[PDB]
């Protein structure tokens, strides 16, 4: 059940993605 | 007496460290009696707004990552480091990534403290600042670093 390697990998890609998009549209009126 | 000193590093480790520490402790350690760190105040402010926001809006991402991650010792630190590098391995860098990462970092740290694990906060702060300034220093210095972020986000709250 799950593998830290895969876990960390998926989380990592997700982290970069979440951040990459969080800049394209800041919910808090970008301020 | 030789060109090498970098306030960015010191200011980064100082801010990040004092951040996770003061944020993961819940207390208030504002006893400088000499310091100030203007950029630090503004920068932090930005981190408070954008940070709290992502925490409230993207709370699902933080919780999920933590749920899968699950950490209780410095050992995993190397694994976390791997995660960071694994995300930067692409070559994409921006305020979005940095803040998102830093945010998740602090959160996990908060949990670490809640689970009586402050000793694992050291690797957290050092790791974040390490990867950020070790592989992405050029990006920071290229976009002004902290200031450029305060300008890109803007936090003007003055009337006159």
UniProtKB/Swiss-Prot annotation, chain A:
A motif (BH3) lies at residues 11-25. The modification Phosphoserine is found at residue 3. The record marks 24-25 as: Cleavage. This is BH3-interacting domain death agonist p13. It is found in: Mitochondrion membrane.
UniProtKB/Swiss-Prot annotation, chain B:
A motif (BH3) lies at residues 43-57. Changing residue 42 to R: No effect on ubiquitination. A motif (BH1) lies at residues 86-106. It is found in: Membrane; Cytoplasm; Mitochondrion; Nucleus, Nucleoplasm. A motif (BH2) lies at residues 138-153. Induction: Expression increases early during phorbol ester-induced differentiation along the monocyte/macrophage pathway in myeloid leukemia cell line ML-1. Rapidly up-regulated by CSF2 in ML-1 cells. Up-regulated by heat shock-induced differentiation. Expression increases early during retinoic acid-induced differentiation. Changing residue 68 to R: No effect on ubiquitination. Cleaved by CASP3 during apoptosis. Treatment with taxol or okadaic acid induces phosphorylation on additional sites. There is a cross-link at residues 28, 31 (Glycyl lysine isopeptide (Lys-Gly) (interchain with G-Cter in ubiquitin)). Interacts with HIF3A (via C-terminus domain). Interacts with BAD, BOK, BIK and BMF. Interacts with PMAIP1. Interacts with BBC3. Isoform 1 interacts with BAX, BAK1 and TPT1. Heterodimer of isoform 1 and isoform 2. Homodimers of isoform 1 or isoform 2 are not detected. Isoform 2 does not interact with pro-apoptotic BCL2-related proteins. Interacts with RTL10/BOP. Interacts with BCL2L11; may sequester BCL2L11 to prevent its pro-apoptotic activity. Interacts with GIMAP5 and HSPA8/HSC70; the interaction between HSPA8 and MCL1 is impaired in the absence of GIMAP5. Belongs to the Bcl-2 family. Involved in the regulation of apoptosis versus cell survival, and in the maintenance of viability but not of proliferation. Mediates its effects by interactions with a number of other regulators of apoptosis. Isoform 1 inhibits apoptosis. Isoform 2 promotes apoptosis. This is Induced myeloid leukemia cell differentiation protein Mcl-1. It comes from Homo sapiens (Human). The gene is MCL1. The chain holds residues 167 to 326 of 350 of the full protein.
């Amino acid at each position: 059940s799950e593998s830290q390697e895969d876990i960390i990998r998926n989380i990592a890609r997700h982290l970069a993605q979440v951040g990459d998009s969080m800049d394209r549209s800041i919910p808090p009126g970008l301020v | 007496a030789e060109e090498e000193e970098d306030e960015l590093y010191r200011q980064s480790l100082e801010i990040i460290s004092r951040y996770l520490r003061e944020q993961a402790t819940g207390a208030k350690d504002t006893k400088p009696m000499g310091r100030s760190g203007a950029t630090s105040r503004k920068a932090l402010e930005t981190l408070r707004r954008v940070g709290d926001g992502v925490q409230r809006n993207h709370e699902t991402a933080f919780q999920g990552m933590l749920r899968k991650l699950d950490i209780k010792n410095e050992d995993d630190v190397k694994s976390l480091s791997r995660v960071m590098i694994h995300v930067f391995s692409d070559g994409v860098t921006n305020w979005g990534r940095i803040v998102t990462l830093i945010s998740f970092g602090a959160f996990v740290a908060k949990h670490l403290k809640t689970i009586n694990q402050e000793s694992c906060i050291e690797p957290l702060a050092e790791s974040i600042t390490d990867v950020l300034v070790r592989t992405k220093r050029d990006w920071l210095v290229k976009q002004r670093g902290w200031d450029g972020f305060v300008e890109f986000f803007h936090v003007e709250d003055l009337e006159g």
